[PDB]
């Protein structure tokens, strides 16, 4: 109906817009109405309707500049409705773009603006952008304030006020904020989950009255640092058009003694006063630290301020506040229950496509050559968050810098065009970038997202059932488990000689049921048991359940259950939720020494044997683990996986690594010289030769006496 | 509101705020950098420098300086905020309307609408910083009526605002005329009724405002005369005993509540009154000098809310006591010790009132520089509220002084003669005059360029029938 | 109305007038009830704080409340959730000596908290507040208000597909057919998680001598050790012998002890405390 098409216009008129006739009679406009165009990010605009039945039915024809500060791009929709109430405007105070005004001699008013809205009668907004062409020269504006506010038509006696300094350019650009979720990838659930328990209780407050609750105020987003945890809460604001109020945390805490609490009573206070608002507390861990840190009077007032105000503003306002902290147990704990920060978002590292789309959004300004492969870098690029994506494209762009520096006087101030224009990134300089990134985001637990399905794992039909039937099943079908009453089974613990694929299955397990897999080795467990990490079993499992589904995996965790830190974990795993789609699942290489206590039931009761890999298996992990390296045609790995029976996946990977070592020597000693692009037979009976079984026949003896004692135990 | 508030004030304000106040400074001794680049020490100096002031002797920041250190501290551009409003004026008024669950104060009150404890302590800026005297014969007059009467005397006086060089962004009162209201003065003292002063005074600052002039202030004389042969009289007000007694402050500071200062920095738009009081005493010496005073932000907002009166010590103000309608908490005036030290000393039965002022520096304009005086007066007409003595303004005193020069010409002597300030306002009392006739006869009595509009004023008929009625009258 | 927290993020010195200022008043406008919220705010462990104006505010309390006791009809009334975290000193004669205890409620108290709160929303006829009230062990009643809002969200986020977010305003029929369902209850059980069984606590425990088969004699046993001096002390007065401290059970693991404590509770009417391994 009113969702006209955009175009190009014909007329260059900043105050124009060409409709059909067809839509002209659809919405009863007329030719020179005034009526107001909203198109995206709640932009609008007063244009002038003029009939032109050269556009097809249902689309309009609006010019550059309208389009640019609509912010909606040709073939966009945009809604038209009557403006019949606009006022002619009383003054019209408007300065000039710096950079449009350079060499302009004489009154640019009177060269420039003084025909043009003259007899016009055109209606300017607050913030709009119209260009004037006079003369030999285009001079673009901004229309500063309008008297009546917000917008008014620009008539005779109109007084225009063209007194000021000139504004740079650089504010708008550099500035950009208001930023869509356009600007935003790969974190589609979260910017859901915000979404949901924000823009609903403001932009439709009739809902809950009519369902008859109080919506929540709370938000607390959390995750790695480097994440765009203010990024996305800036999105979210702009998009709600709510009355924003980002506080910082170092900012109100530089304040002199007796003043961040002012800081935080005045915006508490400014924010109520115009709802809605959408109060943005970033960094909330520096106003609020944990109880064991400072103790300081000064550090205790303003978290007992915080309180004071978050309990002060339980009513009938329409506020939201907002949180942002690295980890969920540097908070205060006094600000996570009932009535405050009570709805938790986790923010994770994103998975290939979501480092494929961040850097289609970082790449887009770039001057990137044609030999670019994105695809290529995102598969390349694992726990890269957002900030290490952006400083990887910052790199690359600073070495081609340097490659084409040979062309570039430091001395001579002024560089030819010609060279500038040479100038482009290559996937050269991408790898380059890589080779010098450091990502930190892994250093510390952390969500991701794992895509292994049962293709990657061998054999072990029988444990992929069980493992099917123990965790697919309550996630799918958890009607069955009421109607029958059963509660589902928490955790299972893996036990087997080392490099038997463990982890595989558990990454596999996580996919199926489509839940984010957090990992934790056996050096994070060390670290945690002599309290110098950063992270602690409650935050673990805390951040486990505000991502659920999520699956916790516990790796050599005998080194652990040989305790406070075992201790710990029970009563974690005792005061997780049954219905809550957690599971944890341990892996150990010697069973009996972990503690009898983590076997009750209730518990990692269920236990399970993963065995070495089959002749079959073996063919297939050959295959998997070679799927793209160059092999020699008409060469068949049965005989080699035949020669290597009772090698577990480690011993696989490692004669794999051989053959390819030999095959690359041999291709480097041959360009030296001056051929070998594939792996001839010859380096895989010499990896043969150097081959080595990783598991003794004790040990191996030992695991299937375990097993049978283990299977006796449950035989009758 | 997204920003800045919109609202307009003087163009004193503005013109102030447009500057930035910044104070060069030139390489020091002690920089270790080249040419270009700058230290600590050849930094330009905020105009709130506490030091340099200290150092200049001048004792109050220049409430503007003030303004602009808040705008510094806080307040970053383009992010962090959504500019909270730096300046708000004191309230110590209970919320009559919290309801976290509890009823009204008469009957009930939580712990977020108490009035916390108030802690006083002597300001940093002075709004008006110099008040200045076009002619001395403004406050000669003033004291000649004592002279004549021996009694005391008060008055308002009027004028308007500018800049202020010798203080980083500093204001200064220029006040053109005295007007006398109604008083019956005596002794020891002098009385006022509230309601009838305020019901003329309303009249007199309309026509004031059509002449251009506005109410800055008002200024009494606390003058007794010795037993010397010659012209002396006692100090009784110096750093010993008082220098505002608590009256006194107490009516200056009714009186700045009630001409609030429009500024476009605060969440109601208003704060700290440009009001100027002055008190005339006499020096340690003989002399008959003038002085200048102005309450407190705090003292202004803590008779508002009633809270303070007098006491028969003349240096201290008694504290009320709590009642309904009226809940005032414990108050702290915290000073420093010789050791440099500060100290909070509860006073509930008294405390000293030099807590509650800041001082202003009178003075007079150069005598041989430019002269921008409105009005070339103070000596002719009698004032207007001067019925006690011979003083009595009437058609044949304006027969006597304004007669012989307008029967005859002398345009130079005829406009001297007419740009008066009572004798203005008398005759626009006569209501001899037509409107536009008075607009006419205002700007050619209080503007240059007059030649032509007093031309036109004796051309109109209203004059002539004004002079006829003078040549009529005895 | 006294907060913790309020009081405490006044400036140096402000903290202690208030009090003052509080106590005065209640004494004038007698009779007054003083409600100190979150006293451990303004009144910690002796050591959990040493900071000089903690210790100022404490002794300013104390004082004031020393002092009130007199024939003034002012009651004071503290709460706090660590019975332990209130300064000692506190709890004396003349100060905080009646004390009183919260436990989680049971199926009837949940049940009733679930019709208190749910009585306003659009339930569908669908509904068996019942179940609900049986399934949730453990819940507090902030957890149940909790779960109401989340299964209302549930069901709005649901009915959202019709509902076109770019119209500020929503078609009439769709706002007036909103009705929350069973399974909206179940989704909000599920997402759920309450807190208060991380720390001990006091519940009620309803089993009988019917969810234990056998033990016949350790239950005439158990019978004779707690129920009759508590059911009848006035025997025992007579024969002056007092009754018995504790007991304690021993066996092969899963024999159900647990369920034995838990039916000795019910049957003298006592609410059960429980203390795990790991706590
Ligand atoms: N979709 C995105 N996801 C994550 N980071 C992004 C995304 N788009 C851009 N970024 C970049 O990632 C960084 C996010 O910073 P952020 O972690 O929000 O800062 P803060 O420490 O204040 O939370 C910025 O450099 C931003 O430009
Ligand atoms: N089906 C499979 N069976 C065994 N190992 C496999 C299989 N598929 C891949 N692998 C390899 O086994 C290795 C397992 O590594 P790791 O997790 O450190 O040991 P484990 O799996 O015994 O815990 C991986 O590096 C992987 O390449
Ligand atoms: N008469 C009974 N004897 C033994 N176990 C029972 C009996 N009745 C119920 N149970 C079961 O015993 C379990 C409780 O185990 P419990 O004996 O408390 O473990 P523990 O002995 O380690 O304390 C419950 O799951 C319940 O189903
Ligand atoms: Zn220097
Ligand atoms: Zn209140």
Same mark, same amino acid.
């Given at each position: 109906?009113?969702?006209?098409?955009?175009?190009?216009?014909?007329?260059?008129?900043?105050?124009?817009?060409?409709?059909?006739?067809?839509?002209?009679?659809?919405?009863?406009?007329?030719?020179?109405?005034?009526?107001?165009?909203?198109?995206?990010?709640?932009?609008?605009?007063?244009?002038?309707?003029?009939?032109?039945?050269?556009?097809?039915?249902?689309?309009?024809?609006?010019?550059?500049?309208?389009?640019?500060?609509?912010?909606?791009?040709?073939?966009?929709?945009?809604?038209?409705?009557?403006?019949?109430?606009?006022?002619?405007?009383?003054?019209?105070?408007?300065?000039?773009?710096?950079?449009?005004?350079?060499?302009?001699?004489?009154?640019?008013?009177?060269?420039?603006?003084?025909?043009?809205?003259?007899?016009?009668?055109?209606?300017?907004?607050?913030?709009?952008?119209?260009?004037?062409? +006079?003369?030999?020269?285009?001079?673009?504006?901004?229309?500063?304030?309008?008297?009546?506010?917000?917008?008014?038509?620009?008539?005779?006696?109109?007084?225009?006020?063209?007194?000021?300094?000139?504004?740079?350019?650089?504010?708008?650009?550099?500035?950009?904020?208001?930023?869509?979720?356009?600007?935003?990838?790969?974190?589609?659930?979260?910017?859901?989950?915000?979404?949901?328990?924000?823009?609903?209780?403001?932009?439709?407050?009739?809902?809950?009255?009519?369902?008859?609750?109080?919506?929540?105020?709370?938000?607390?987003?959390?995750?790695?640092?480097?994440?765009?945890?203010?990024?996305?809460?800036?999105?979210?604001?702009?998009?709600?058009?709510?009355?924003?109020?980002?506080?910082?945390?170092?900012?109100?805490?530089?304040?002199?003694?007796?003043?961040?609490?002012?800081?935080?009573?005045?915006?508490?206070?400014?924010?109520?006063?115009?709802?809605?608002?959408?109060?943005?507390?970033?960094?909330?861990?520096?106003?609020?630290?944990?109880?064991?840190?400072?103790?300081?009077?000064?550090?205790?007032?303003?978290?007992?301020?915080?309180?004071?105000?978050?309990?002060?503003?339980?009513?009938?306002?329409?506020?939201?506040?907002?949180?942002?902290?690295?980890?969920?147990?540097?908070?205060?704990?006094?600000?996570?229950?009932?009535?405050?920060?009570?709805?938790?978002?986790?923010?994770?590292?994103?998975?290939?496509?979501?480092?494929?789309?961040?850097?289609?959004?970082?790449?887009?300004?770039?001057?990137?050559?044609?030999?670019?492969?994105?695809?290529?870098?995102?598969?390349?690029?694992?726990?890269?968050?957002?900030?290490?994506?952006?400083?990887?494209?910052?790199?690359?762009?600073?070495?081609?810098?340097?490659?084409?520096?040979?062309?570039?006087?430091?001395?001579?101030?002024?560089?030819?065009?010609?060279?500038?224009?040479?100038?482009?990134?290559?996937?050269?300089?991408?790898?380059?970038?890589?080779?010098?990134?450091?990502?930190?985001?892994?250093?510390?637990?952390?969500?991701?997202?794992?895509?292994?399905?049962?293709?990657?794992?061998?054999?072990?039909?029988?444990?992929?059932?069980?493992?099917?039937?123990?965790?697919?099943?309550?996630?799918?079908?958890?009607?069955?488990?009421?109607?029958?009453?059963?509660?589902?089974?928490?955790?299972?613990?893996?036990? +087997?000689?080392?490099?038997?694929?463990?982890?595989?299955?558990?990454?596999?397990?996580?996919?199926?049921?489509?839940?984010?897999?957090?990992?934790?080795?056996?050096?994070?467990?060390?670290?945690?048991?002599?309290?110098?990490?950063?992270?602690?079993?409650?935050?673990?499992?805390?951040?486990?359940?505000?991502?659920?589904?999520?699956?916790?995996?516990?790796?050599?965790?005998?080194?652990?259950?040989?305790?406070?830190?075992?201790?710990?974990?029970?009563?974690?795993?005792?005061?997780?939720?049954?219905?809550?789609?957690?599971?944890?699942?341990?892996?150990?290489?010697?069973?009996?020494?972990?503690?009898?206590?983590?076997?009750?039931?209730?518990?990692?009761?269920?236990?399970?044997?993963?065995?070495?890999?089959?002749?079959?298996?073996?063919?297939?992990?050959?295959?998997?683990?070679?799927?793209?390296?160059?092999?020699?045609?008409?060469?068949?790995?049965?005989?080699?996986?035949?020669?290597?029976?009772?090698?577990?996946?480690?011993?696989?990977?490692?004669?794999?690594?051989?053959?390819?070592?030999?095959?690359?020597?041999?291709?480097?000693?041959?360009?030296?010289?001056?051929?070998?692009?594939?792996?001839?037979?010859?380096?895989?009976?010499?990896?043969?030769?150097?081959?080595?079984?990783?598991?003794?026949?004790?040990?191996?003896?030992?695991?299937?006496?375990?097993?049978?004692?283990?299977?006796?135990?449950?035989?009758? | 509101?997204?920003?800045?508030?919109?609202?307009?004030?003087?163009?004193?304000?503005?013109?102030?705020?447009?500057?930035?106040?910044?104070?060069?400074?030139?390489?020091?001794?002690?920089?270790?950098?080249?040419?270009?680049?700058?230290?600590?020490?050849?930094?330009?100096?905020?105009?709130?420098?506490?030091?340099?002031?200290?150092?200049?002797?001048?004792?109050?920041?220049?409430?503007?300086?003030?303004?602009?250190?808040?705008?510094?501290?806080?307040?970053?551009?383009?992010?962090?905020?959504?500019?909270?409003?730096?300046?708000?004026?004191?309230?110590?008024?209970?919320?009559?309307?919290?309801?976290?669950?509890?009823?009204?104060?008469?009957?009930?009150?939580?712990?977020?609408?108490?009035?916390?404890?108030?802690?006083?302590?002597?300001?940093?800026?002075?709004?008006?910083?110099?008040?200045?005297?076009?002619?001395?014969?403004?406050?000669?007059?003033?004291?000649?009526?004592?002279?004549?009467?021996?009694?005391?005397?008060?008055?308002?006086?009027?004028?308007?605002?500018?800049?202020?060089?010798?203080?980083?962004?500093?204001?200064?009162?220029?006040?053109?005329?005295?007007?006398?209201?109604?008083?019956?003065?005596?002794?020891?003292?002098?009385?006022?009724?509230?309601?009838?002063?305020?019901?003329?005074?309303?009249?007199?600052?309309?026509?004031?405002?059509?002449?251009?002039?506005?109410?800055?202030?008002?200024?009494?004389?606390?003058?007794?005369?010795?037993?010397?042969?010659?012209?002396?009289?006692?100090?009784?007000?110096?750093?010993?005993?008082?220098?505002?007694?608590?009256?006194?402050?107490?009516?200056?500071?009714?009186?700045?509540?009630?001409?609030?200062?429009?500024?476009?920095?605060?969440?109601?738009?208003?704060?700290?009154?440009?009001?100027?009081?002055?008190?005339?005493?006499?020096?340690?010496?003989?002399?008959?000098?003038?002085?200048?005073?102005?309450?407190?932000?705090?003292?202004?907002?803590?008779?508002?809310?009633?809270?303070?009166?007098?006491?028969?010590?003349?240096?201290?103000?008694?504290?009320?006591?709590?009642?309904?309608?009226?809940?005032?908490?414990?108050?702290?005036?915290?000073?420093?010790?010789?050791?440099?030290?500060?100290?909070?000393?509860?006073?509930?039965?008294?405390?000293?009132?030099?807590?509650?002022?800041?001082?202003?520096?009178?003075?007079?304009?150069?005598?041989?520089?430019?002269?921008?005086?409105?009005?070339?007066?103070?000596?002719?007409?009698?004032?207007?509220?001067?019925?006690?003595?011979?003083?009595?303004?009437?058609?044949?005193?304006?027969?006597?002084?304004?007669?012989?020069?307008?029967?005859?010409?002398?345009?130079?002597?005829?406009?001297?003669?007419?740009?008066?300030?009572?004798?203005?306002?008398?005759?626009?009392?006569?209501?001899?005059?037509?409107?536009?006739?008075?607009?006419?006869?205002?700007?050619?009595?209080?503007?240059?360029?007059?030649?032509?509009?007093?031309?036109?004023?004796?051309?109109?008929?209203?004059?002539?029938?004004?002079?006829?009625?003078?040549?009529?009258?005895?």
């Amino acid at each position: 109906d009113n969702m006209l098409l955009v175009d190009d216009a014909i007329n260059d008129d900043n105050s124009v817009i060409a409709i059909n006739s067809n839509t002209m009679d659809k919405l009863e406009l007329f030719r020179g109405d005034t009526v107001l165009v909203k198109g995206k990010k709640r932009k609008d605009t007063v244009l002038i309707v003029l009939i032109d039945d050269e556009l097809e039915d249902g689309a309009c024809r609006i010019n550059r500049v309208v389009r640019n500060n609509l912010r909606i791009r040709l073939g966009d929709l945009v809604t038209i409705h009557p403006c019949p109430d606009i006022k002619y405007a009383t003054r019209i105070s408007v300065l000039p773009i710096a950079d449009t005004i350079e060499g302009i001699t004489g009154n640019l008013f009177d060269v420039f603006l003084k025909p043009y809205f003259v007899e016009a009668y055109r209606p300017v907004r607050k913030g709009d952008h119209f260009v004037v062409r +006079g003369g030999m020269r285009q001079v673009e504006f901004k229309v500063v304030d309008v008297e009546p506010e917000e917008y008014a038509v620009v008539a005779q006696d109109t007084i225009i006020h063209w007194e000021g300094e000139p504004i740079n350019r650089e504010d708008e650009e550099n500035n950009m904020n208001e930023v869509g979720y356009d600007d935003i990838g790969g974190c589609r659930k979260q910017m859901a989950q915000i979404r949901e328990m924000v823009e609903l209780p403001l932009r439709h407050p009739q809902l809950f009255k009519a369902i008859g609750i109080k919506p929540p105020r709370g938000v607390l987003m959390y995750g790695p640092p480097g994440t765009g945890k203010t990024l996305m809460a800036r999105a979210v604001a702009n998009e709600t058009g709510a009355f924003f109020f980002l506080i910082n945390g170092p900012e109100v805490m530089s304040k002199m003694a007796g003043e961040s609490e002012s800081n935080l009573r005045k915006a508490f206070e400014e924010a109520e006063k115009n709802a809605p608002a959408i109060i943005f507390i970033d960094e909330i861990d520096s106003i609020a630290p944990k109880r064991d840190k400072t103790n300081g009077e000064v550090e205790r007032r303003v978290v007992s301020q915080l309180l004071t105000l978050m309990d002060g503003m339980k009513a009938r306002s329409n506020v939201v506040v907002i949180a942002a902290t690295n980890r969920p147990n540097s908070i205060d704990p006094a600000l996570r229950r009932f009535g405050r920060f009570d709805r938790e978002v986790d923010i994770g590292i994103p998975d290939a496509t979501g480092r494929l789309e961040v850097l289609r959004i970082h790449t887009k300004n770039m001057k990137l050559a044609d030999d670019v492969d994105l695809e290529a870098l995102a598969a390349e690029t694992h726990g890269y968050v957002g900030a290490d994506i952006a400083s990887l494209c910052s790199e690359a762009a600073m070495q081609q810098i340097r490659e084409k520096m040979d062309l570039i006087d430091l001395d001579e101030d002024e560089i030819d065009a010609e060279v500038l224009d040479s100038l482009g990134v290559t996937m050269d300089n991408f790898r380059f970038a890589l080779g010098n990134s450091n990502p930190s985001a892994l250093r510390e637990t952390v969500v991701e997202s794992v895509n292994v399905t049962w293709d990657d794992v061998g054999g072990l039909d029988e444990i992929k059932e069980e493992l099917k039937e123990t965790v697919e099943y309550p996630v799918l079908h958890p009607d069955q488990y009421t109607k029958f009453g059963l509660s589902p089974s928490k955790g299972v613990l893996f036990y +087997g000689p080392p490099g038997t694929g463990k982890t595989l299955l558990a990454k596999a397990v996580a996919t199926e049921v489509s839940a984010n897999f957090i990992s934790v080795k056996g050096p994070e467990l060390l670290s945690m048991w002599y309290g110098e990490s950063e992270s602690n079993i409650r935050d673990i499992f805390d951040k486990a359940r505000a991502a659920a589904p999520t699956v916790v995996f516990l790796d050599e965790l005998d080194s652990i259950a040989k305790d406070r830190v075992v201790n710990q974990l029970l009563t974690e795993m005792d005061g997780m939720n049954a219905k809550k789609n957690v599971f944890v699942i341990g892996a150990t290489n010697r069973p009996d020494q972990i503690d009898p206590a983590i076997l009750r039931p209730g518990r990692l009761d269920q236990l399970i044997y993963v065995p070495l890999p089959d002749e079959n298996a073996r063919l297939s992990i050959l295959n998997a683990q070679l799927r793209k390296t160059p092999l020699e045609p008409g060469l068949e790995l049965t005989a080699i996986a035949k020669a290597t029976q009772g090698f577990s996946g480690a011993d696989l990977l490692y004669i794999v690594q051989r053959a390819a070592k030999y095959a690359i020597k041999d291709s480097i000693e041959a360009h030296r010289q001056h051929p070998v692009p594939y792996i001839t037979k010859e380096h895989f009976a010499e990896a043969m030769k150097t081959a080595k079984r990783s598991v003794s026949d004790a040990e191996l003896r030992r695991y299937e006496a375990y097993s049978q004692q283990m299977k006796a135990s449950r035989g009758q | 509101r997204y920003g800045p508030l919109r609202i307009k004030e003087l163009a004193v304000d503005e013109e102030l705020e447009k500057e930035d106040g910044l104070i060069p400074r030139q390489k020091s001794k002690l920089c270790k950098h080249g040419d270009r680049g700058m230290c600590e020490y050849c930094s330009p100096l905020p105009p709130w420098d506490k030091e340099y002031h200290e150092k200049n002797k001048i004792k109050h920041i220049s409430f503007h300086s003030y303004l602009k250190k808040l705008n510094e501290n806080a307040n970053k551009k383009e992010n962090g905020s959504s500019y909270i409003s730096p300046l708000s004026e004191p309230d110590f008024r209970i919320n009559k309307r919290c309801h976290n669950g509890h009823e009204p104060w008469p009957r009930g009150i939580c712990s977020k609408c108490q009035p916390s404890a108030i802690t006083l302590q002597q300001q940093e800026f002075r709004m008006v910083d110099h008040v200045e005297f076009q002619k001395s014969e403004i406050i000669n007059e003033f004291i000649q009526a004592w002279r004549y009467t021996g009694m005391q005397r008060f008055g308002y006086m009027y004028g308007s605002y500018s800049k202020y060089d010798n203080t980083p962004l500093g204001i200064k009162a220029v006040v053109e005329a005295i007007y006398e209201p109604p008083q019956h003065d005596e002794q020891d003292g002098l009385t006022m009724d509230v309601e009838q002063v305020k019901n003329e005074m309303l009249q007199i600052d309309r026509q004031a405002q059509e002449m251009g002039l506005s109410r800055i202030g008002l200024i009494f004389t606390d003058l007794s005369d010795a037993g010397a042969g010659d012209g002396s009289v006692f100090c009784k007000r110096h750093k010993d005993s008082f220098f505002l007694s608590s009256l006194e402050v107490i009516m200056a500071a009714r009186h700045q509540t009630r001409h609030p200062n429009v500024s476009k920095y605060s969440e109601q738009g208003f704060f700290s009154s440009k009001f100027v009081t002055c008190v005339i005493s006499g020096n340690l010496e003989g002399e008959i000098d003038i002085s200048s005073y102005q309450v407190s932000t705090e003292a202004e907002a803590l008779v508002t809310a009633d809270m303070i009166s007098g006491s028969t010590f003349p240096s201290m103000a008694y504290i009320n006591d709590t009642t309904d309608e009226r809940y005032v908490p414990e108050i702290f005036y915290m000073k420093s010790n010789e050791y440099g030290i500060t100290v909070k000393e509860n006073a509930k039965p008294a405390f000293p009132v030099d807590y509650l002022l800041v001082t202003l520096t009178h003075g007079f304009p150069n005598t041989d520089t430019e002269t921008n005086s409105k009005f070339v007066s103070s000596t002719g007409f009698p004032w207007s509220n001067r019925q006690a003595m011979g003083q009595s303004q009437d058609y044949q005193e304006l027969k006597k002084y304004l007669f012989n020069v307008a029967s005859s010409g002398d345009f130079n002597l005829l406009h001297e003669k007419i740009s008066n300030f009572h004798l203005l306002l008398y005759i626009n009392s006569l209501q001899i005059l037509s409107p536009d006739e008075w607009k006419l006869l205002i700007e050619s009595a209080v503007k240059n360029e007059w030649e032509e509009s007093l031309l036109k004023l004796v051309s109109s008929a209203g004059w002539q029938t004004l002079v006829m009625i003078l040549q009529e009258s005895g």
